[PDB]
Symmetry: D2
Subunit: 492 residues, 4 copies
């Protein structure tokens, strides 16, 4: 029945008047100014990502301020995301900053700290103390973004591995390393992260994009690192290796969402398996009711070219068809030449794919997996979305203080916009990673506690009127969950 | 339910024992020799494509002869296809050259035509006319290259034997994001019609001069398989490329991986829900034959087909096991190379009798499945001769 | 799936905590006194029927007064119904006597009419005319007694407030086996329309003079409930019978037993599959409210209804729990007595305020369900005011 | 969707050209002559039941001969059923053949054999040795078809029960007794049965209607009593009490079919519960794929009246709607006044109900309960019937030597006739209790072993042509199961 829906499509018919997918932009040189962040919002940015791989706290403080000021000038709410550096496995130094590794040659990798600066083509340092304890003969070591492949022959001692060089490649100082068939037990957060996170709390960030997540226990470590004052910040887990993939179920349970880092996974896993891994992860998140980001290598060529390749375009479309809440831009907005154009084009592709997407298959698929008896909240939200399909309603209004019920509704995928009416600002921002949802702040301090709920509902319906989703005569499905309620409202 | 099926998947499991999707390679400078063609076959080529936009009849004649030699030396059957040069505007359907070329194809005994620039339904009748009565058995696959082909897709499919989505050609007028969507449309319309569809141009292009393709190119091929394409096509990658064998082998690997992830039952069920009641007998037999694969968890189907018709009918319903087609016409073997999920076995009547009680043909099919590791003793296997007959056989 | 539900049944299990089907008793010589009527109520009577084929307006006036006294003394609400004497032929719809009688019914404030011998749709408008503007709120239940009523059933249902299958009358022209089948038809058409239907005549007749009925009579009543009848009717058994209380009590026992065997979900689902998309809001709210009973296994519904309309709308979808209707009009309580699966609670506005925030009404409904043992702490309960609203309430 | 099907019905439209339900007639005084058995066949008798409660072997030998000669004269095949007497609990004798039991009075029932002839209102004999060991205080004893109810107060000794008489009723010599809340452990077959069965084998009867079945173990006892030469005779279990009902699952597994004896069950169980018990038993049999007979009190009033009551008519119709393969006539044909008329009317009622019956609900319901993976045979038969619905075929041809695959097909309930083509005569008779199936004998001895199957198929299709179910152009679904096969045949 996606198939059936395909039969009735016409590419000349008008696209939807709404875009369900959300866009995350990485901020850097090309876009850190208030006037550029402004052009980014208008192009369709909902989330601003700061990459703490680079920059000092000083640089990001500017991004924060520039974001908060861009948003407030445009009257909108924009999420601020902190993407951590995370633990790294790297080489040490080489004599003459360099070491020409030739295919067939033998070399020795050592965890012996003495060799940190005096590396040679023959014996050099890798900074991960457990290397020997975790690698075994036959396994591979990737150095320099997977380019250099060394095969492990044996242990020279308990600190040194004898390796065959399997392919020629020159490598220089401090290259990154990957262990494709190895369970890496680095801690969850690096000493730096712990400081960067602490900073994030202090500065009131919305979500952590947590690097190199490999197990559920590690999500706890990240949480415990955000400490007692960080309990409302969302942890979005970056899945970057086989471990993340193997442990996905338990990781999804503990976390608040998922980022599929295709490029990182790609270093260690064949591209065609990463495609499939994207499918699995997006679908698990859809079923769990948690946002999922499709990240890296999205419209990469458009970092320096005016238009992207055909294949990059289908890549973006097919992330939407897979079920991504979000698509992310990295270099294309951090240091690209067409930062507005890329966001605009991404929005257009998403919008096109959404018009081809049969949402009803999602609703069905997710509803079919519910255990009977359902809990009240699951029942109210799914029947609310069912009511949309059955009455052809044209908007939904969701009253939610923490975003929870808005995410519960969005999970069921109605074929019309969801308007969340909330009394928390951080909620309006945090929902920026949830597909199909738009927020409205309701100031309970100034406008009253609305214990009746009539004002928030009215605020909801008016919001949907200005945007032109509903007009007089259309239907609109209202929901307050947690005590609960549902109404099918005729619009006046 | 593709969604539910995704939930159960592991990328660390072993891949399926067979690849369903089919690879078409354009022949050229890199690949015209008997040996290079042998490499192509072993790498995963099912169909040799001659681009008649280049080279003389002598060049192409050489392609045909070498393909035949390479295949016969390897003991397989390879399809040969003629891709015509061709002409909101309307020029004639076939050009004068096209008409000359098509006649040549018939004399040489090509298996199918890739008709360029098809824009409407009578244009197919023209290609059919130009092939004359001696080319009546030759498949016509229509290349959809502009908005008119898209607009008139329904009637074009009705008349043709299949479709090719030419993404690159379509992309000149139509924005890229819309080609993606048109790809979905055309593939699904063809799946429903039960006719082969080829996803073509811009497949793994960077691999024409690079040893490995881009990640985006990889998902393109996989998503073509997920869309429902029977076939994926290589152009420059094999004709003038530097890595012809590597590109084919990779395309095969991508397809096998995608297929492990693909839920065939979603296809079966979606296509079944569309059948009008009452069904005709051929339709009912084939759908319910595939239905029986699912209900009994049969590990292979065996289809007796002379013209390949009932083979394509079974394949349309997308069983989750290999389909072995047993046939008396070597042309059917070649032609079934554009139909996903099917492998052919030639039964030589002139050398083994007419077998009008079907026992021997059936036995050759089951033996083939046994030899390919699809079924062993105690597995079920669904046999269909469509006059028609289903049989659920316990394999001994 | 009634089939699958049958598989899981045990006749040795305890019966359901409530009876859904409703019992109508004809009043007469055996049962006209205040005490006898009290016996009838306690035995299971929901609706007193006056046969206006017999007795004067004085006789019937006595029925009305005694019924009112008996009910008020017991603290329940009993519906009063006027069954008119009435006229391939066509006489007029109402006779002169009928017209006089109907006017009398309005003055007295009867709850519903049982219109004899209805043969077509305008004939209903006539009954409606004869009731005048002061009887606009009175339900008209059409008695289908011959082939014309059967033939014109669709349009008759459209205009009426409900139907009565008069098996005995129908049986004079139509062979018995066909009446059985016509019973199925009429009941199902009414279930779909969402209007009450009464199965009447020849119910437990041998029990007019025998202390127990025949086994066949017993399955007749049970199969009426299985067909989907809202109501079952006693005629001579209670009017002139020897065992009026025993017959009612037995009818109740048969109904309770049948209902334990009945799968309500088959009804819900069958009726749902028939709704045209898009549904209007009232329809969608009620179907999905019942849907929520099933999905959450709620143990009771609470419906706020002033005219009983949304109560009959919910009841149409056949939840598998009791429906408690809270209402400001005592007439609604009486009228809902011909609707299966519903029990009413009177909310007196003049004594408790308009409760336009609905809290107090809802609370009286839940308290009623608590008191009847339907829900306890931790059970779910589905509340609906249809402007409209569903709520899934956790009972404290 | 029976509901939906009801919406489209018109009682004036023509009834089906075929009757799926089968009719069992008890033979006695009114119908034992060859010319009466002939009028019974023409009225619609498929099965002739002999009630070994009455008559000597001599009387039944006549019924047998008269049946076999009636059938052979009409060219048809008719089943011969032996209904056993079974174990009985009875009283002994009373002084003056009588004892006036008055309500409130006390009495003593004893298993003491000495009291066999000298029973009084005060103390009398009941012939079931285990009575005391199985009854306990509070339980009831029914004497004389449930009319007299005695309540058990206590044990006078280990052989004698003290009883309150709960209602007045005079009782005479040798009245039957029932123990409504007691697990009666009488053996499966009485000494007489053992002789009657032995006779049945010898005389080649088709099916045993086995009385008072209470457990699966007892079906084994009946089987073992039919001995080695009786292995192809069908055992149809009569369910007559709470035990039969409680043990139904295991009883159905061991037996070849079920008779719902409503009157017998009625002695001990309230009528409204018997209605429901009928529902359960018919449905279990439908799912098991085994014939079920609806028996007793069917058209009883028509034993002496020309026409039956309305309620008896709906009783018969609703047995068809419940899913009965068969409806049975007892006294109405054994000793009634209108033996032809009753059979004719029964046939008419069945035919009417069948036209109202949506068979597709049955097919669906039964198919939905199949375990996946199915076994080949289950798959072939269900898909064959599915093919009927999908192609609107108008007959089925089933090649079956033992009837097994014909019963497997019939279980799935196609909406068209099933023609079984068989090489066994006992098979043609034994299928007389299976709804929707007609048989044809194929003489493999004389016409050849047809290992191709083309002749039997041809015999099938021609049989369906003469009956007018199929004409040139219609579809017909053919099946050989056990190796197997299915064909959708276009009729020439
Ligand atoms: O100034 S730099 O060019 O060093 C620079 C600074 C910040 C970022 S963030 C990213 S990302 O796209 O990889 O996330 N790239 C860069 C590059
Ligand atoms: O001899 S050439 O190198 O000119 C040559 C010959 C044949 C073909 S076919 C294709 S295509 O499939 O990529 O369009 N390109 C070429 C190039
Ligand atoms: O006083 S009488 O005994 O004549 C008498 C009075 C009223 C009624 S109502 C019915 S009926 O419901 O059975 O048709 N029978 C009678 C009989
Ligand atoms: O000659 S008798 O009237 O004694 C007589 C003989 C045989 C049978 S068989 C039945 S049955 O209908 O109960 O099965 N009743 C009778 C009655």
């Amino acid at each position: 029945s996606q198939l059936a829906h395909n039969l009735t499509l016409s590419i000349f018919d008008p696209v939807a008047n709404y875009r369900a997918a959300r866009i995350i932009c990485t901020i850097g040189p090309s876009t850190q100014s208030v006037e550029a962040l402004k052009g980014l919002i208008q192009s369709g940015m909902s989330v601003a990502r700061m990459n703490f791989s680079h920059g000092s706290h000083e640089y990001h403080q500017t991004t924060i301020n520039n974001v908060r000021q861009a948003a407030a000038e445009l009257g909108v709410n924009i999420a601020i995301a902190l993407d951590t550096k995370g633990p790294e496995i790297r080489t040490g130094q080489f004599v003459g900053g360099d070491a020409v590794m030739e295919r067939g040659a033998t070399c020795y990798v050592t965890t012996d700290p003495a060799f940190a600066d005096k590396g040679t083509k023959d014996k050099f340092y890798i900074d991960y103390q457990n290397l020997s304890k975790v690698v075994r003969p036959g396994n591979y070591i990737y150095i320099d973004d997977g380019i250099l492949i060394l095969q492990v022959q044996s242990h020279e001692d308990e600190q040194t591995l004898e390796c065959t060089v399997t392919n020629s490649h020159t490598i220089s100082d401090r290259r990154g390393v990957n262990l494709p068939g190895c369970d890496v037990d680095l801690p969850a957060v690096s000493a730096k992260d712990r400081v960067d996170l602490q900073f994030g709390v202090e500065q009131g960030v919305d979500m952590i994009f947590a690097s190199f997540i490999r197990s559920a226990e590690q999500v706890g470590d990240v949480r415990k690192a955000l400490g007692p004052k960080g309990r409302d910040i969302m942890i979005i887990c970056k899945i970057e290796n086989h471990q993340g993939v193997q442990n996905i179920d338990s990781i999804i349970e503990e976390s608040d969402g998922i980022m599929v880092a295709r490029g990182d996974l790609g270093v260690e896993i064949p591209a065609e398996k990463v495609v499939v891994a994207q499918k699995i992860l997006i679908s698990k998140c859809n079923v769990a009711g948690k946002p999922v980001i499709c990240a890296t290598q999205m419209l990469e060529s458009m970092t320096y070219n005016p238009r992207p390749t055909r294949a990059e375009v289908s890549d973006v479309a097919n992330a939407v068809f897979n079920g991504a809440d979000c698509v992310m831009l990295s270099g294309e907005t951090a240091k690209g030449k067409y930062p507005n154009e890329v966001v605009q084009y991404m929005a257009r592709i998403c919008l096109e794919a959404q018009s081809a997407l049969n949402e009803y298959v999602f609703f069905n698929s997710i509803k079919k997996l519910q255990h009977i008896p359902m809990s009240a909240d699951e029942a109210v939200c799914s029947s609310a979305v069912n009511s949309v399909y059955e009455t052809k309603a044209k908007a939904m209004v969701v009253l939610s203080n923490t975003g929870r019920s808005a995410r519960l509704v969005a999970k069921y995928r109605p074929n019309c916009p969801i308007v969340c009416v909330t009394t928390r600002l951080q909620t309006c921002r945090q929902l920026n990673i949830t597909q199909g949802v738009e927020s409205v702040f309701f100031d309970a301090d100034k406008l009253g506690h609305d214990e009746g709920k009539e004002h928030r509902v009215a605020a909801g319906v008016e919001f949907a009127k200005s945007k032109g989703y509903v007009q007089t005569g259309d239907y609109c499905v209202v929901i307050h969950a947690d005590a609960n309620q549902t109404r099918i409202l005729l619009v006046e």
